Design a protein around this ligand. Structure first.
Ligand SMILES: *C(=O)[C@@H](NC(=O)[C@@H](C(=O)O)c1ccccc1)[C@@H]1N[C@@H](C(=O)O)C(C)(C)S1
Ligand SMILES: [Cl-]
Length: 498
């Protein structure tokens, strides 16, 4: 009297609308009792052939496992193929009906979903993070065996309970769009890597999370580690000039600045001891605060930071979640960091203000822009479909967030701005960036529609290699196309029709 396991059916993963993303499909595995095989040696060659194995090597393996009562022949054949071997009636050959995961969207959502074991245990991404929920509990079968031991099947001791279903926050339609457009952007620019995150400003849901390179989890032969990283969550980078709107939020909240205030940025450089702060465009003197963002003046943002102090900038960044724990619990997710100082020297103050010295994830950057677009209120992040929205936390004053939103709409819409971020039919807001690593990261971060925001988006492209490499040239056009499609796919009313 012994017990054999009764495999449980692992729960289905779907996207937010119910589209299957991970399904456990019936699969047959074959094992043998060598002691029973040792009584039917003349059958071995035909069985070896039916397993695509060499007869002599196969025979060797059963001889050297002769004294054992159990060994695997092969795992995870199709039910019809496993019937082929079962049909040739070899003594001591048995079958086990297991389940095997299939991923219908393949590489399009591989980084979010992850994958399972040969045992159908989650070992990456969502499959790992929600493993206890999805797994269910295997059963126990009471079985009688003779002293060979040939099994000669009594009753179910304990039933199998299937795993529970799970609906992600991801919208597969948005995911496909983002994937295709990020991929196109990568190839066109000779880029090495990239991330794109799309977030629902009002509910905290991650509507799309896509990276390049990626991999097809359905093929065990193409699990190459470098292409398996969910870069949006597990890789960090200096956000660069994409953090300037949060510097600006500190300035406006300080009570010392308004959008119409002027800063003098001539001659487009500022010498701070050994360190020189430099702008790309150096034919400006007086700029207002909206102008500082539109032209992305480093000198301008540094002078404001000197006036208000680094501490005020650090707290806005901390509050919005940059370099902080997101609390999602995605496997291998990084926290990043905001630097700290007892006393902040000028050079450190300036570099913070325009996005160096700190390290963030793409998901953190998108979460920060989402809170800004949601009138300064940060809704907790979710990877699962949200039906009842949790209470959000006020992180920037509504009034300040509104002003900064307007300024950002101007960076997209005014002359001298990131016109390639413009979304046909809609008002859009955002900020470009280009950070060093002569290697660069091209960036665009933003949200839309400007009159009542719905979606925040970050596009991060690593090391473009074709002439133009600024965030406004490389990443902005991706924001434009993906945002255009996402908006209409979500049936959001156009707010900039003529
Ligand atoms: C923010 O990213 C800023 N970048 C730089 O000032 C500058 C640097 O970090 O050394 C730089 C990087 C790459 C190429 C040129 C200069 C400003 N914002 C950028 C943007 O909006 O994309 C720039 C390039 C306009 S400068
Ligand atoms: Cl970290």
């Amino acid at each position: 009297v012994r017990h054999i396991a009764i495999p449980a059916h692992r729960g289905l993963i779907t996207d937010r609308n119910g589209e299957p993303l991970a399904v456990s499909t019936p699969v047959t595995t074959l094992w043998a009792n060598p002691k029973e095989l040792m009584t039917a040696k003349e059958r071995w060659p035909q069985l070896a052939a039916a397993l695509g194995q060499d007869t002599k090597l196969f025979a060797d393996r059963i001889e050297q496992n002769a004294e054992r009562e159990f060994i695997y022949l092969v795992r995870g054949l199709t039910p019809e193929q496993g019937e082929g071997v079962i049909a040739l009636k070899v003594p001591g050959v048995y079958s086990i009906e297991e389940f095997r995961r299939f991923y219908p969207a393949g590489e399009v959502v591989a980084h979010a979903v992850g994958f399972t074991d040969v045992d159908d245990r989650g070992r990456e991404g969502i499959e790992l993070a929600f493993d206890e929920w999805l797994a269910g509990v295997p059963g126990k079968r009471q079985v009688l065996k003779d002293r060979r031991g040939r099994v000669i099947d009594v009753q179910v001791t304990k039933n199998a309970k299937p795993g529970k279903t799970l609906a992600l926050s991801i919208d597969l339609r948005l995911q496909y769009l983002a994937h295709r457009e990020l991929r196109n952007a990568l190839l066109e620019n000779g880029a090495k890597a990239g991330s794109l995150v799309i977030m629902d400003v009002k509910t905290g849901e991650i509507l799309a999370m896509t990276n390049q390179p990626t991999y097809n989890p359905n093929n065990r032969r193409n699990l190459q580690p470098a292409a398996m990283r969910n870069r949006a969550m597990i890789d960090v980078f200096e956000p660069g000039s994409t953090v300037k709107p949060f510097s600006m939020s500190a300035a406006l909240a300080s009570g010392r600045w308004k959008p119409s205030d002027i800063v003098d940025v001539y001659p487009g450089t500022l010498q701070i001891g050994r360190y020189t702060i430099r702008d790309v465009s150096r034919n400006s003197r007086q700029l207002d605060l909206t102008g500082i963002l539109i032209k992305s003046s480093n000198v301008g943002i540094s002078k404001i930071a000197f006036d208000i102090g680094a501490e005020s900038i650090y707290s806005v960044m901390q509050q919005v979640g940059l370099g902080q724990d997101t609390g999602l619990g995605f496997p291998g997710e990084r926290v990043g960091n905001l630097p700290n100082h007892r006393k902040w020297p000028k050079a450190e103050t300036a570099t913070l203000a325009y996005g160096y010295g700190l390290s963030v994830t793409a998901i953190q950057l998108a979460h920060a822009y989402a809170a800004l677009a949601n009138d300064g209120k940060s809704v907790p992040l979710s990877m699962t479909r949200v039906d009842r929205v949790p209470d959000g936390v006020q992180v920037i004053s509504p009034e300040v967030a509104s002003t900064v939103q307007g300024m950002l709409q101007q960076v997209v819409e005014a002359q001298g701005g990131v016109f390639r971020a413009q979304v046909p039919g809609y008002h859009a807001a955002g900020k470009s960036g280009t950070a060093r690593k002569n290697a660069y990261r091209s960036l665009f971060a933003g949200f839309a529609p400007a009159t009542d925001p719905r979606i925040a988006m970050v596009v991060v492209i690593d090391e473009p290699s074709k002439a133009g490499y600024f965030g406004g040239l490389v990443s902005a056009p991706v924001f434009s196309k993906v945002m255009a499609g996402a908006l209409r796919l979500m049936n959001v009313p156009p707010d900039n029709l003529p």
